[PDB]
Chains A and B, each alone.
With several copies, the nearest count.
Chain A
Amino acid sequence: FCRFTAEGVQEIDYKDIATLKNYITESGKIVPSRITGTRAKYQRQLARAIKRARYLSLLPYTDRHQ
């Protein structure tokens, strides 16, 4: 039950923070493709986006850090 297949997105955006936030943990970790049911191709992209965000301090690497 993938979101990105239905939406039909060409590429996942690191700037689209809200969207990312659904796929990240309360502890900051990226959520598995088993749980979200994201398609494999998209999942990788999502992960990449998240990583990018983390570099730009848009998303946090973890809950504890400060």
Chain B
Amino acid sequence: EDPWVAIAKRYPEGTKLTGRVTNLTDYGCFVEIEEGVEGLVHVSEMDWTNKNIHPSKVVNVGDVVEVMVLDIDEERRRISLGLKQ
């Protein structure tokens, strides 16, 4: 209900955010801060190396970082943030 009706605030293409990461699922990092949402920053960006990266080595656990949206689906609640910016 509450985050997902008017999900146009941080939308427009690249609004940078400061978000604490929660759990890094070996494909992802799960930074999610903006009032009950979920972001990923999965593994492809994260750095400027693609595949050999393993996100636990490269950033942190529980830390507020540089992230912005890059993509929102307000329907299948997958805001797909990035970190290579």
Contact = CB atoms under 8 A, between A and B. Distances in A.
Query: Are any A and B Cβ atoms less than 8 Å apart in their complex?
Result: yes
A62 interface: no
A31 B2 contact: no
- Chain A, interface size category, equals 10 to 19
A58 to B, nearest CB: 17
B77 A36 contact: yes
Contacts of A11: none
B78 A35 contact: yes
A24 B75 contact: yes
A45 interface: no
A25 B36 contact: no
B27 interface: no
Contacts of B74: 22
Contacts of A24: 75
11 contacts: A1-B36, A3-B2, A6-B2, A18-B5, A22-B74, A22-B75, A24-B75, A25-B75, A25-B76, A31-B75, A36-B4
Given A22-B75, A23-B75, 18 more contacts: A1-B36, A2-B1, A3-B1, A3-B2, A4-B1, A6-B1, A7-B1, A18-B5, A22-B1, A22-B4, A22-B74, A24-B75, A25-B75, A26-B73, A26-B75, A31-B76, A35-B76, A36-B77
